[PDB]
Design a protein around this ligand. Sequence first.
Ligand SMILES: [Zn+2]
Length: 30
Amino acid sequence: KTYQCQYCEKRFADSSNLKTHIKTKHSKEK
Ligand SMILES: [Zn+2]
């Protein structure tokens, strides 16, 4: 129905939001 992350516990509304999320919060801890 919805998509979620596997690194942290955040949710997204499409697999587009998620696609960016990762290099926002999981950008090599920087
Ligand atoms: Zn995450």
